[PDB]
Design a protein around this motif. Structure first.
Motif, PDB file in Angstrom:
ATOM      1  N   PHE A 116      -4.516 -32.025 -43.981  1.00 37.57           N
ATOM      2  CA  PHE A 116      -3.157 -31.576 -44.254  1.00 37.57           C
ATOM      3  C   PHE A 116      -2.134 -32.624 -43.829  1.00 37.57           C
ATOM      4  O   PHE A 116      -1.163 -32.884 -44.551  1.00 37.57           O
ATOM      5  N   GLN A 117      -2.339 -33.248 -42.668  1.00 40.77           N
ATOM      6  CA  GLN A 117      -1.386 -34.250 -42.201  1.00 40.77           C
ATOM      7  C   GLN A 117      -1.354 -35.474 -43.114  1.00 40.77           C
ATOM      8  O   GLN A 117      -0.280 -36.032 -43.384  1.00 40.77           O
ATOM      9  N   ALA A 118      -2.519 -35.919 -43.591  1.00 39.93           N
ATOM     10  CA  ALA A 118      -2.545 -37.053 -44.511  1.00 39.93           C
ATOM     11  C   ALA A 118      -1.782 -36.742 -45.795  1.00 39.93           C
ATOM     12  O   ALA A 118      -0.978 -37.563 -46.278  1.00 39.93           O
ATOM     13  N   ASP A 119      -2.011 -35.554 -46.359  1.00 40.03           N
ATOM     14  CA  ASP A 119      -1.267 -35.175 -47.556  1.00 40.03           C
ATOM     15  C   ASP A 119       0.232 -35.148 -47.281  1.00 40.03           C
ATOM     16  O   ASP A 119       1.038 -35.581 -48.118  1.00 40.03           O
ATOM     17  N   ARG A 120       0.625 -34.643 -46.110  1.00 38.54           N
ATOM     18  CA  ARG A 120       2.038 -34.606 -45.751  1.00 38.54           C
ATOM     19  C   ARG A 120       2.647 -36.002 -45.742  1.00 38.54           C
ATOM     20  O   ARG A 120       3.757 -36.212 -46.252  1.00 38.54           O
ATOM     21  N   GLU A 121       1.941 -36.968 -45.152  1.00 41.78           N
ATOM     22  CA  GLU A 121       2.454 -38.336 -45.110  1.00 41.78           C
ATOM     23  C   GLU A 121       2.689 -38.873 -46.517  1.00 41.78           C
ATOM     24  O   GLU A 121       3.756 -39.440 -46.822  1.00 41.78           O
ATOM     25  N   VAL A 122       1.696 -38.698 -47.392  1.00 43.56           N
ATOM     26  CA  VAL A 122       1.831 -39.195 -48.761  1.00 43.56           C
ATOM     27  C   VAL A 122       3.059 -38.582 -49.433  1.00 43.56           C
ATOM     28  O   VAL A 122       3.877 -39.284 -50.054  1.00 43.56           O
ATOM     29  N   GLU A 123       3.213 -37.261 -49.304  1.00 46.94           N
ATOM     30  CA  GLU A 123       4.319 -36.585 -49.976  1.00 46.94           C
ATOM     31  C   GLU A 123       5.670 -37.073 -49.467  1.00 46.94           C
ATOM     32  O   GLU A 123       6.604 -37.262 -50.255  1.00 46.94           O
ATOM     33  N   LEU A 124       5.806 -37.263 -48.152  1.00 44.67           N
ATOM     34  CA  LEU A 124       7.094 -37.706 -47.624  1.00 44.67           C
ATOM     35  C   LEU A 124       7.471 -39.084 -48.157  1.00 44.67           C
ATOM     36  O   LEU A 124       8.633 -39.324 -48.541  1.00 44.67           O
ATOM     37  N   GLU A 125       6.508 -40.010 -48.181  1.00 45.63           N
ATOM     38  CA  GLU A 125       6.810 -41.327 -48.737  1.00 45.63           C
ATOM     39  C   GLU A 125       7.293 -41.205 -50.179  1.00 45.63           C
ATOM     40  O   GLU A 125       8.295 -41.826 -50.577  1.00 45.63           O
ATOM     41  N   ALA A 126       6.596 -40.389 -50.974  1.00 49.47           N
ATOM     42  CA  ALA A 126       6.991 -40.230 -52.369  1.00 49.47           C
ATOM     43  C   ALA A 126       8.409 -39.685 -52.485  1.00 49.47           C
ATOM     44  O   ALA A 126       9.183 -40.130 -53.339  1.00 49.47           O
ATOM     45  N   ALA A 164      11.116 -32.436 -57.720  1.00 53.23           N
ATOM     46  CA  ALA A 164      10.999 -30.994 -57.516  1.00 53.23           C
ATOM     47  C   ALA A 164       9.557 -30.601 -57.212  1.00 53.23           C
ATOM     48  O   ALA A 164       9.281 -29.841 -56.264  1.00 53.23           O
ATOM     49  N   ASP A 165       8.613 -31.123 -58.002  1.00 55.21           N
ATOM     50  CA  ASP A 165       7.213 -30.766 -57.772  1.00 55.21           C
ATOM     51  C   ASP A 165       6.739 -31.210 -56.389  1.00 55.21           C
ATOM     52  O   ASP A 165       6.041 -30.461 -55.684  1.00 55.21           O
ATOM     53  N   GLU A 166       7.107 -32.426 -55.979  1.00 58.23           N
ATOM     54  CA  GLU A 166       6.679 -32.919 -54.674  1.00 58.23           C
ATOM     55  C   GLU A 166       7.226 -32.051 -53.550  1.00 58.23           C
ATOM     56  O   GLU A 166       6.523 -31.775 -52.568  1.00 58.23           O
ATOM     57  N   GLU A 167       8.484 -31.626 -53.662  1.00 56.02           N
ATOM     58  CA  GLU A 167       9.055 -30.783 -52.617  1.00 56.02           C
ATOM     59  C   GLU A 167       8.300 -29.467 -52.497  1.00 56.02           C
ATOM     60  O   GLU A 167       8.024 -28.998 -51.382  1.00 56.02           O
ATOM     61  N   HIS A 168       7.947 -28.855 -53.628  1.00 56.04           N
ATOM     62  CA  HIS A 168       7.182 -27.611 -53.543  1.00 56.04           C
ATOM     63  C   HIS A 168       5.831 -27.827 -52.859  1.00 56.04           C
ATOM     64  O   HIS A 168       5.411 -27.018 -52.010  1.00 56.04           O
ATOM     65  N   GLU A 196       3.246 -27.575 -45.249  1.00 54.00           N
ATOM     66  CA  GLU A 196       3.809 -27.206 -43.952  1.00 54.00           C
ATOM     67  C   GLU A 196       3.489 -25.757 -43.601  1.00 54.00           C
ATOM     68  O   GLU A 196       3.186 -25.440 -42.442  1.00 54.00           O
ATOM     69  N   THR A 197       3.548 -24.859 -44.588  1.00 48.36           N
ATOM     70  CA  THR A 197       3.185 -23.471 -44.314  1.00 48.36           C
ATOM     71  C   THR A 197       1.742 -23.357 -43.835  1.00 48.36           C
ATOM     72  O   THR A 197       1.448 -22.616 -42.887  1.00 48.36           O
ATOM     73  N   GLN A 198       0.822 -24.074 -44.485  1.00 48.25           N
ATOM     74  CA  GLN A 198      -0.582 -23.982 -44.081  1.00 48.25           C
ATOM     75  C   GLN A 198      -0.795 -24.533 -42.677  1.00 48.25           C
ATOM     76  O   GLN A 198      -1.599 -23.994 -41.906  1.00 48.25           O
ATOM     77  N   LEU A 199      -0.101 -25.615 -42.330  1.00 50.45           N
ATOM     78  CA  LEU A 199      -0.217 -26.137 -40.968  1.00 50.45           C
ATOM     79  C   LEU A 199       0.283 -25.123 -39.945  1.00 50.45           C
ATOM     80  O   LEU A 199      -0.323 -24.950 -38.879  1.00 50.45           O
ATOM     81  N   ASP A 200       1.389 -24.438 -40.252  1.00 49.22           N
ATOM     82  CA  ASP A 200       1.876 -23.392 -39.353  1.00 49.22           C
ATOM     83  C   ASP A 200       0.847 -22.279 -39.188  1.00 49.22           C
ATOM     84  O   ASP A 200       0.625 -21.782 -38.075  1.00 49.22           O
TER      85      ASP A 200
END
Ligand code: HEM
Ligand code: HEM
Ligand code: HEM
Ligand SMILES: [Fe+2]
Ligand SMILES: [Fe+2]
Ligand SMILES: [Fe+2]
Ligand SMILES: [Fe+2]
Ligand SMILES: [Fe+2]
Ligand SMILES: [Fe+2]
Ligand SMILES: [Fe+2]
Ligand SMILES: [Fe+3]
Ligand SMILES: [Fe+3]
Ligand SMILES: [Fe+3]
Ligand SMILES: [Fe+3]
Ligand SMILES: [Fe+3]
Ligand SMILES: [Fe+3]
Ligand SMILES: [Fe+3]
Lengths: 157, 157, 157, 157, 157, 158, 157
Positions: E87-97, E125-129, E135-139
């Motif tokens: 999950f954290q790796a995916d988060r990093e990729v999305e933020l850079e994008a 828009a798609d990346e933000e969703h 983030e919800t899954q990490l919580d």
């Protein structure tokens, strides 16, 4: 169950080759479609999807043996301008793959691993079929010509 | 019922001719399909199965007269490289068959055997139709050309 | 892609054997049907069609390797008169084919050609099944007898 | 056709192993279902049916070579109390089978018998898949725990 | 009509990012499926397919402006071991994008190119969703616990 | 609601351009069909219908802002005799439209009018697609040849 | 294949006769329908269509032999006033055709052309059937009378 290092090395090299082929076939299909050669574009798209299927099978086999697939490495991707050049680039890729597959089948079967050998045997059959198609198309282009051959794949819609 | 030896001789010679035609037509269809000329290949395949039907009818007639069909003897099978050469080889085979059929019909009908004569009459009609098609295709190739004619029988799949 | 001369030699010899089998099986089916043995005739017809499919596959493989299929050869075709003789002739043909197939598989696989070996492996499996059926039928004829065995395959309609 | 005594010995040993596996798997399925673990019981029953299919194929192959299948002897059947113990017993059985299959494939293929080798190859693929599933389930039990793992395979009905 | 070099540079950088995301997501889906976490695997597979939809759109836009898509280079692909790391790796990729997309939209819209800006707006828009879902899954993992969380995504058949 | 004079001026100029395009495309389709080039005729007819839809949308937007649409103007209508000439005339029309649309989008968005800007954005996307098709066809004519190109769009029918 | 001039002469004469018959039959059908004799008109129309089919077959045969069909020559067309005269004119035409057909069949069959003879044989059978119908109708008119016969074919709808 853990496989030998060499069998996993062969599988990883084949996986890298499959990923490179996927990329090249997709780029060629898009380039062909952009120019108006629709009937070629359909075939190239289908071939790229076949390459994806091969890559997925290889990944499954590698994972089942307690290995780590390599999704980071790529070979050199060739891009063509004419139609003859595209056909020749595909031919080069296929020939390299066939030679590697034969050597790998021998080595794997010599170490009492049969399922990996069967995987390569199926992949080898498919590669030979595709190379046959490419050689036939090159012969057709030589006999007819660029313009007369291209007039048969362009469509108005 | 026992037929004369000469009627059975005529029937056996025709059977040998039909078997040779089956072989030649199927080989030509495979050769054409290998090169990418799909619409020609379909037609050649259909003609080979017509050779089916003729040979089976001849065998039935020979057996009904208390004879022994000859499934061991073959004539010379011609193989072509171009498309014109394939058409010419088929033409030669058909002409030989037509002449033999006419002579046999006369001889059989002169000895009070009508069913055999009717068999040859039907076969003769079919052979004449096929030879007509072949001559038309040769004329078309002459008028248009090899490349322009070949561009109309190639598909992608 | 060009194969070795020896692999093509093996494939051509197998193709000649397949053509001879086609001829023999079809003639036997016609002979059996003429005498009133109906179910035997149906079975023999199906077997001849199977041999036809095998021959087509062999031709495809030979052509893909840049070879010339041989459609002029023919071995000796055996013709029987009673059921026992027909079964024995088929047995002889099958045994010859099986031995040749095993030798060819070894030789081909020793030269890094796998697809040809797989073709022969499939053909070998089918041949073994057919030889099993023939031996069972011969045993049944021996146990019951000619007349009591033939009374079960004769139909009137 | 008569096979070598050694090939038949290998086939008979594999058949005995298959029968022992059938017995063990079905007993385990009944024991699991009795305790209320329904979703495990369904899977175990399916596996036992697969083992039967393998045994039937082996019997057919042995009979085709003029041999006598051995339906009398059994190996040691292991019975477990927990769920971890059941998984471990199945793992032991599968590992023994895989080693035997590899050795047999080599020996058979060295004597020019290909169909038997293909039978063992298919059985080997299936065994490897099942062992993969078992190892995954053991890992899951280790990670979650026995109570939290068992709460997910129980229903009321 | 041909675009500025800078707009094409932005589009090519985004295309490289999309290809890297495709690779990472597919590898993660395979790794998750291998361990027995099924519903997670389905979701990750769907996300990878979305990433290719984006990549194809980007390639089309680049080609329409008389450019050359870059199908050769990749960024660094991150591989995780437990759910939290994936999950954290995916988060990093999305933020850079996300950051890149915002900067690119500003620059493109400042040079009178609107269609490219709309392409990036949809992708953003798609990346933000997707980042919201991660983030919800990490919580959820933080609250429930990792074993109690994993017990809800494991299935049997 | 009343828009600025300049936004309505931009919309009216675009409407005049759309009407001119409708006329030119329909005439070209009829000319092509008369000569026996059938598939080209079908494509050109579809394009003319698309231009009609664009014109209707522009009229709706102009009316919503308390304006008066201009249905009397017309620019110069180009007529070609070859196939290359028809393609080139269409290319000219499309390029003019694209430049005007970009300038208008900037000006409108600078005055706090968003719906008009979105209308032009959609029209701009469609124009770019059509110009792409035209350039591809011109390249094909250059490569194959004009006779060998025309042999692929003729049919007997009837 | 080129036929003898005499066979083509016979075929052309028959074709001229067929065209004359088509014209006469259609005119008679229109004349009958104009007067209110509907049930006769339907039959006459069908007969004219039959003559049309015969003419098409003759044209095909002539063209297959490398000849030139004659579509410029006509015989004398007879027009009748009462129903008896129409029947008699049709009878005359049919008798001439039958005699010509018999002579032609003999001559053609004497020169080893069989397909042409079969064409005339079929045409001869049809002509004999039609002449039979005409003679029956004339007999009926003689027995009943003009008015009583005509009252049965007049309809009002
Ligand atoms: C069963 C497995 C797979 C299936 C069913 C599948 C299916 C698809 C589909 C539906 C598309 C969209 C086609 C298009 O945009 O025209 C596509 C494109 C693509 N997929 Fe695959 N895919 C599979 C495996 C993979 C794998 C393993 C990779 C990379 C490791 C991959 C990478 C791509 C890429 C890069 C494209 C787009 C490139 C192009 O335009 O040709 N796919 N695939
Ligand atoms: C007396 C000898 C033969 C007989 C009676 C015979 C009969 C037939 C018949 C009835 C069919 C099915 C008809 C159709 O579907 O068109 C057929 C098809 C076929 N025949 Fe034969 N045949 C003979 C010899 C051969 C030979 C010499 C070859 C090739 C060397 C051959 C190969 C085939 C194949 C491959 C097909 C399937 C068609 C395809 O896959 O395209 N047969 N034959
Ligand atoms: C089969 C369908 C239709 C036919 C046959 C048809 C007929 C026509 C034709 C032939 C023209 C222009 C002829 C010329 O200028 O030489 C026209 C003008 C026009 N049409 Fe259509 N029409 C159709 C559908 C539509 C639709 C669906 C719309 C709107 C949704 C539309 C809106 C217009 C407009 C706005 C004009 C004139 C605009 C201007 O001149 O500035 N039409 N009609
Ligand atoms: Fe591949
Ligand atoms: Fe024929
Ligand atoms: Fe065979
Ligand atoms: Fe088993
Ligand atoms: Fe996404
Ligand atoms: Fe427009
Ligand atoms: Fe007639
Ligand atoms: Fe390939
Ligand atoms: Fe024939
Ligand atoms: Fe067989
Ligand atoms: Fe199992
Ligand atoms: Fe994306
Ligand atoms: Fe437009
Ligand atoms: Fe008539």
């Amino acid at each position: 169950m853990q496989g030998d290092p060499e069998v996993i090395e062969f599988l990883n090299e084949q996986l890298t080759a499959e990923l490179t082929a996927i990329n090249q076939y997709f780029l060629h299909a898009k380039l062909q479609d952009h120019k108006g050669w629709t009937k070629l574009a359909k075939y190239t798209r289908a071939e790229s999807f076949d390459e994806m299927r091969h890559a997925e099978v290889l990944t499954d086999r590698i994972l089942l043996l307690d290995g780590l697939p390599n999704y980071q490495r790529l070979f050199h991707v060739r891009v063509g301008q004419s139609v003859t050049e595209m056909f020749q680039a595909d031919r080069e890729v296929e020939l390299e793959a066939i030679d590697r597959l034969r050597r790998g089948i021998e080595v794997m079967r010599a170490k009492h691993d049969i399922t990996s050998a069967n995987v390569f045997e199926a992949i080898l059959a498919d590669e030979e079929h595709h190379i046959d198609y490419l050689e036939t198309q090159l012969d057709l282009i030589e006999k007819l010509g660029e313009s007369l051959y291209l007039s048969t794949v362009i469509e108005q819609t």
